[PDB]
Amino acid sequence: GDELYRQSLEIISRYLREQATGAKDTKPMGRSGATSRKALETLRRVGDGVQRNHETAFQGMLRKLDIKNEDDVKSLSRVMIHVFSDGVTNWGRIVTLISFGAFVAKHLKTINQESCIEPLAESITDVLVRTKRDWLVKQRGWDGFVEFFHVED
Numbered sequence: 001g002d003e004l005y006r007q008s009l010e011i012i013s014r015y016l017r018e019q020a021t022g023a024k025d026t027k028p029m030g031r032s033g034a035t036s037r038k039a040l041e042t043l044r045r046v047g048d049g050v051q052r053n054h055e056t057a058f059q060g061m062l063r064k065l066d067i068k069n070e071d072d073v074k075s076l077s078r079v080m081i082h083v084f085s086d087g088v089t090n091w092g093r094i095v096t097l098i099s100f101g102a103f104v105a106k107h108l109k110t111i112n113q114e115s116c117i118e119p120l121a122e123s124i125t126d127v128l129v130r131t132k133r134d135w136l137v138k139q140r141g142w143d144g145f146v147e148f149f150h151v152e153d
């Protein structure tokens with residue numbers, strides 16, 4: 001859904017691509033870029049931590065998923081939604097979702113399937129924005145995300 005979707009995709013795509021390669025995208029963001037930059041910095045901090053602390057569970061999940069190609073990415077929606085929509089809603093779960101997205105993006109890079117990353121990012125965004133739309137809006141979106149993880153300074 002429009003601006004929230006566009007911003008969300010921009011953030012999630014840049015994070016996954018950045019994580020898969022070692023490259024930081026210089027191209028401009030768009031309509032709320034300052035916030036998106038802060039969200040991206042926040043992701044570098046918190047998302048990387050989530051990947052280290054959960055590497056075993058993540059490895060298990062990647063293993064069960066058996067992702068080899070773009071069709072495998074395109075068929076993830078139902079598991080993704082099933083795991084994500086269960087339980088409580090908080091920013092930590094959104095971080096887990098995106099962070100596993102990065103874990104997968106690195107795997108895709110490893111097996112020379114870089115082209116799958118952008119569809120992956122799209123799928124995650126679709127899931128996030130459809131399942132949590134009203135909550136995300138109530139939390140002031142990515143502004144709420146940056147504030148939630150703001151490190152007192």
Ligand SMILES: O=C(O)c1c(CCCOc2cccc3ccccc23)c2cccc3c2n1CCC[S@]3=O
Pocket residue numbers: 057058061076079080081083084085093096097098100101104124
């Ligand atoms: O919703 C969650 O808390 C969750 C998530 C986030 C929601 C489901 O996320 C996905 C589920 C399936 C495929 C995914 C592909 C790209 C990004 C996220 C995907 C999660 C992701 C990977 C591994 C686990 C994940 N969990 C549970 C915590 C331990 S582990 O079972």
